Write a protein that binds this DNA or RNA. Sequence first.
RNA 1: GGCCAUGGAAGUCGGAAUCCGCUAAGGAGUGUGUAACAACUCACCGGCCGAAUGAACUAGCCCUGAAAAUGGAUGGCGCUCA
Lengths: 107, 170, 52, 62, 190
Amino acid sequence: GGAREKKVQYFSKLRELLEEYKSIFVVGVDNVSSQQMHEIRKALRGDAVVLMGKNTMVRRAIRGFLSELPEFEKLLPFIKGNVGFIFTNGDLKSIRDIVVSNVVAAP
Amino acid sequence: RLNEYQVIGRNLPTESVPEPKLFRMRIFAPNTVVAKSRYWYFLQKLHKVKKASGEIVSVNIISEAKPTKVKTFGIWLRYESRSGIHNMYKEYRDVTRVGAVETMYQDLAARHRARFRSIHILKVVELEKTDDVKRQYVKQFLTKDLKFPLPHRVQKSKKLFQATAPTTFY
Amino acid sequence: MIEPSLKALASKYNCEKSICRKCYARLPPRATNCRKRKCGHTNQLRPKKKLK
Amino acid sequence: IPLDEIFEIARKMQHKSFGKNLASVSKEILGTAQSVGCRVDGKNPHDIIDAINAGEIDVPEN
Amino acid sequence: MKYIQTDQILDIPEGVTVDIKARVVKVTGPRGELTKDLKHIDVTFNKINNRAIKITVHNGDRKHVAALRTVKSLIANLITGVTKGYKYKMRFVYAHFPINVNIIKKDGQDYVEIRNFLGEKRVREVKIHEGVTMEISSTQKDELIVSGNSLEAVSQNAADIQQICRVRNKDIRKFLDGIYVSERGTIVEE
RNA sequence: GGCCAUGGAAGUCGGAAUCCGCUAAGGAGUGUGUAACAACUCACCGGCCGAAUGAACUAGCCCUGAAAAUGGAUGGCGCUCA
Ligand SMILES: [Mg+2]
Ligand SMILES: [Mg+2]
Ligand SMILES: [Mg+2]
Ligand SMILES: [Mg+2]
Ligand SMILES: [Mg+2]
Ligand SMILES: [Mg+2]
Ligand SMILES: [Mg+2]
Ligand SMILES: [Mg+2]
Ligand SMILES: [Mg+2]
Ligand SMILES: [Mg+2]
Ligand SMILES: [Mg+2]
Ligand SMILES: [Mg+2]
Ligand SMILES: [Mg+2]
Ligand SMILES: [Zn+2]
């Protein structure tokens, strides 16, 4: 029974943050460590919320609920691959300063 | 070689009870002597009645409704093994309800060594919907545009010797 | 002395095995049954013991 | 024994648990110090911890 | 259960021409031709197009169905053998005694001659199968390259070399000496 | 590098513990590797494909269990959709 309840909490906190802020853009990563992700949210205390999860659940759990919050619809074809979310609202420059900040590279 | 019979019987009327309830069973038996025998066998498994205290009221053959319509049957079974008593459900393809039961008796003899005496037929149902078919060994014949060859045909010869090389095309 | 890269390559063939508990057979580590008919394809297996 | 300083240990080790809002750092010490086992308000932690974890008395310190 | 029909689809790349007649598969590619007889199996073949072939088993039981994807895989290995080749790399593993490996030719036959294996005075000779090429790697110390179109012959010659170097009467967990297959790939890297 | 044991043990010698915090994800750790770390691997969560999958049990035939002495007996030959 637990997974469906945890699924219920996921779609719950998904729509909770959706209305409370607004507007988000492309947010995909790869080869990103767990400590890597802890760094961004360490300085992004309240200004942004690192909404995280997966793909298939996020698509349909929002796609079916395109009634109380329609608008998106054709927005779903954007979500491909390893993509997270940084729930916030500031400006195109103001988020990339705080978000793009840490980079870990390799040959 | 079996037939399906409708057998109806009742307790012998008494001055206390002059019209006892009539009970019917559908019996798959080779003849009417075994049909009335199987009837009393199952009534004494369910009701306080005996052949000495009862009466057979009617025995009638139940013919197939559409004997040239291909159907899929589900048969619910209760059989005895060497160790215990088991419930089972199996499916058969045939055009008559009787011919599916005949296949069932051959089938439990071959895979479970269950003799005629060890089997109770709980229910025979014609599956109307394709979603009602649960078993794959009969579901594979309900696919669209089913074709298949019969490779390696062996022809039975009337003679002992044949003057030409054997073949198996077909 | 064998370099650690080659010692793992050699250990893949000599050490990384399971052993049948009844008839002593060298089986793949992931095997669930023994391949030999003499023991009845038993599931009673145990890893090949290592030097220590 | 907090002695009005268990937040100090959290705010002295202020660079640790990258949690939610400061009090999450306190829980890191709460969880890790339970592996010792002392006079933690009379018993072991993972209990008095788990009180305010759900919400016992009051530490929403700013 | 006697599955009524089971199918597998071969995929034929652009430059390859499979050719089947009476369960005798002849695969032709840029690298050459390979042939295989499958008369020990009851399978039928249908050419879907020049790039795909259907392989069918009709009314087959569990084991006879199991024998279908193996036919697919064998023909696919033939196809990739005549379009990419096969290459097995072997590393010489020894703790004390260096293994002296030479490619000799005696009686008109190619042989792999292993000397000094675990200090033995015995000279080991392994016949090189036809269609199999041996080479002593220059880029790697103690490396032998076994290459060829047929995967079966290449892997079996490699196995011959590995098997002739088994250790007896010792703790093989401790005495790890031998010649082992280190890389199984293709002539054309992908 | 949790505590204590330990020459040293940091998850991977051994004992109380088995928690917390971020997490969608992660055990005071499933292994290989180090004197010890490191290292990689796994536990679980991701991306990808996309329609099935896992577990326990029941009983039919077959197999293991199943070792004796002159050479030899489903009566013999032989029989494998028998
Ligand atoms: Mg997250
Ligand atoms: Mg009763
Ligand atoms: Mg009968
Ligand atoms: Mg049958
Ligand atoms: Mg059947
Ligand atoms: Mg009975
Ligand atoms: Mg004739
Ligand atoms: Mg010895
Ligand atoms: Mg069985
Ligand atoms: Mg067996
Ligand atoms: Mg036996
Ligand atoms: Mg005999
Ligand atoms: Mg016959
Ligand atoms: Zn065994």
